[PDB]
Amino acid sequence: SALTQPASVSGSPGQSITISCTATSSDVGAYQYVSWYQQYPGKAPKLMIYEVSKRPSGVSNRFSGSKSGNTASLTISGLQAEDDAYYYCNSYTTSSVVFGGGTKLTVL
Amino acid sequence: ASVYAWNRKRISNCVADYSVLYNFAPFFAFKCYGVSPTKLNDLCFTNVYADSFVIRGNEVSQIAPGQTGNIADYNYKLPDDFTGCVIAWNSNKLDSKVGGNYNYRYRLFRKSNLKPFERDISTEIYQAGNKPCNGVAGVNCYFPLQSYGFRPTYGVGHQPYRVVVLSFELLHAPATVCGPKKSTNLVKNKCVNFNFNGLTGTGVLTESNKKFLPFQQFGRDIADTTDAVRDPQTLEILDITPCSFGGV
Amino acid sequence: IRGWIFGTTLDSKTQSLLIVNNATNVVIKVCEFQFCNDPFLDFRVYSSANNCTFEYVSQPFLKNLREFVFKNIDGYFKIYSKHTPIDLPQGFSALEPLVDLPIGINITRFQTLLALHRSYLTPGDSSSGWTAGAAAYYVGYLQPRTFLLKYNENGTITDAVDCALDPLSE
Amino acid sequence: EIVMTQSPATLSVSPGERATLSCRASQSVSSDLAWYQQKPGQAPRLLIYGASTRATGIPARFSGSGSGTEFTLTISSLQSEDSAVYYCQQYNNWPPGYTFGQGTKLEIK
Amino acid sequence: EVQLVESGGGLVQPGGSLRLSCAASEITVSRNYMSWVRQAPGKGLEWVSVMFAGGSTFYADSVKGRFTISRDNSKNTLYLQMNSLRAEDTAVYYCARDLGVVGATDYWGQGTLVTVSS
Amino acid sequence: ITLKESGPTLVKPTQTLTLTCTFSGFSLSTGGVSVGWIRQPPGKALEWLALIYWDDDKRYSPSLESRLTITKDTSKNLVVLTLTNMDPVDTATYYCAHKTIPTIFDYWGQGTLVTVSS
């Protein structure tokens, strides 16, 4: 509602799929800092990517972010069975950090 | 419906369980006037009216007996001796859209207060003391209704709220909507205190062999002694005999 | 004959009562609709605005002698009935409790309801009327009396004696 | 009672250029705002209401912007008489409510 | 012209009472959301009170229980009664007709000074 | 009923374009209601793209399936369209219309003009 993410997505194992976390709200700022979190089956979210097109060393090389303007198209190539989890988006606003409405990714 | 255009309905002639509500939702606003919420499911009423509409967040307090405001004094007013109650639960998953949901409005300007359960729909352009700006703009020609315009970036105070108002009656009531009942499971062959739909007595219950006519509910021997009764659940006929007594 | 109308007046000035049978079901309503000078002859309805308070429906009441008893004393209006093969027969037969309605309208006047196939319809007409089959209906008025009722082995009334008709009966 | 904080306090710009003044809220004020110019010696004057709508008569030289928790008023070309005080008034709760600022003093040369 | 003119400003001993009055022209007040604003010398402004078009009025917390707004509708004018003036309440009071979401406060009054003995 | 699309106006070859269609007047909870996408090349006729029914059983055009995973969120009543691997055939306008079974796409949105080139 503050930021916005679709209900859920489910991509077949071994292909690529991209998810968007559109702001759907005027003056969310420049929408430049955008972090993504992997929520495991009952664990604390881990920073997967920040600075969408950048990526922190320590995770695989298949996740990849992008920017089509005002949103963050999170892409995942070579989907593996380990990837069944929850995904969230995060971006600073003018006054305080805001989160996305959440997205669920189930591999089948 | 909108606050000033509630969708009136009546709910009578039914065995009403006022506790089927509690399995619905968290019931953000649930306080009952004139009748306790705990003792609602059992009490009976004349005619139960239902008004359904949507308001903003910080204005739900104005729907109360004798309370003045801008939605209570201008477009929806319930009595001070009101019997029934109001139920409001935040709903901005089906009512607040991005850009402003200009579907729920509220009379902001008017002439005087309104009477209890007085609903008005008029959307004329309000006066301006003198002849107003009929169909035009100008100094002070301010429409009386104003849309809320809910969006999913509004704070909880500016979010849409669905609300239902139930109006009961307790004066002269022809009990038509109430009573959950409680058919205590049947026991046979022991002298037991029974209450069959008001018929109270004591005795031993035994399988009957007499053919009650389909319109009959009671059985009597000579001298009005209630001898038998038919089940209101399974319609089986039962014989009543007073349990054993005697001298020693 | 397909229905009746009761009440203190036929105008909408009071919440009069309506009972109308049909080939499919009975429809009972109490809504103070002002009616015409005469019941409309079927052009399916003829009445003014309404303030209905009660409505109900159930299966229809249909040489066969249909008998009805209409009573309304305690704020309730009660119907008993019987349908018999076959003028009034001399046979004894008791009427059974059909419905106990809760409407508490002060009923003072009552009428019958007619219909007809491919008949013209107007709110008011003279004694010319419209064609119909040969039929008749009898009307009688009840009185407070003392009755001796005889119940059989199966719980049905088989005979009755008027306690105040003649000395032998008394 | 939402407290509004304007910034900066003072501004001295050569005649004829632009001036930018920020007034900062602490919660969500969406597009409920207004800007008043109270020339020293009498009552204030409404310039821009709502989010950025320019009040009638008010020279287009003023421009308001912002939404949510941060707002800004902007003047195109200060003339010598533009020196006055400005206040951003919010009204997210209208019956009964308004909340004023601390004011800003703008002058020229 | 459309205007709001005020009266009642002056000097009174502490604990005393006072009455502020607001006159209008070419516009009505009885059916107009009225709002009295005030300004302490050198400080900002503050919403003091409001009366609706049905009569249900409201007041700020700082002056709750001491001031009372009224209006002689018969002759198209507004009033604000004050009492128990303490050291804070020394301010210049303005009359305003506030609309809110449909056009923010616009038409204001010449003001009225309210000071105390000391 | 009203709908509105939004998203990127420009995109590069072989990239994932995303679009969000926000509507007003209806929601994604009632029966029959659905949301579909349509594209139109400059000066040519429309074509279908995808559809999301109200029971969350989703449908796409047969020719262009196995991609463009259309997701949605019925809480804020929003539909999301995402198309990867842009080709010069994909240079067209895009509209989000509401679909019922007989009156296919009777309520269209705003539309975002998108170009695919360097």
Numbering used by the authors:
A (entry chain J): 2 to 109
B (entry chain A): 348 to 595
C (entry chain B): 101 to 142, 157 to 176, 187 to 210, 215 to 298
D (entry chain H): 1 to 109
E (entry chain K): 1 to 118
F (entry chain I): 2 to 119
Publication passage describing the model:
Elite nAbs, mainly derived from the IGHV2–5 and IGHV3-66/53 germlines, showed potent neutralizing activity across Wuhan-Hu-1, Delta, Omicron sublineages BA.1 and BA.2 at picomolar NT50 values. In this study, we used single-cell sequencing technology to isolate hundreds of monoclonal antibodies from convalescent patients of BA.1 breakthrough infection and identified dozens of elite antibodies with NT50 values at the picomolar level. To further analyze the molecular basis for these elite nAbs, we determined the structure of Fab in complex with Omicron BA.4/5 S-trimers by cryo-EM combined with X-ray crystallography. Next, we evaluated the epitopes of these elite antibodies and found that these antibodies mainly fall into two distinct groups, which was consistent with the results of the epitope competition assay.
Compared with a single antibody, four cocktails, TH003 + TH027, TH027 + TH132, TH027 + TH257 and TH272 + TH281, showed significant advantages against the BA.1.1 variant. The 2 RBDs in the up conformation are clamped tightly by the Fabs of TH027 + TH132 and TH272 + TH281. For the 1 RBD in the down conformation, the Fab molecule can hardly be built due to poor electron density, indicating potential steric hindrance from the neighboring molecule. By structural analysis, we confirmed that the pairing strategy combining RBD-2a + RBD-5 communities could tolerate the key escape mutations of BA.4/5, including L452R and F486V, and could perfectly block the outer face and RBM face of the RBD simultaneously. TH027 + TH132 and TH272 + TH281 cocktails also showed good neutralization activity against BQ.1.1 and XBB variants, and the neutralization level was at picomolar NT50 values. TH027 and TH272 do not directly block the binding of the RBM but can tightly bind with both the up and down RBDs. Meanwhile, TH132 and TH281 target the RBM face of the RBD and can bind with the RBD only in the up conformation but recognize and tightly bind with residues that are crucial for RBD folding and ACE2 binding.
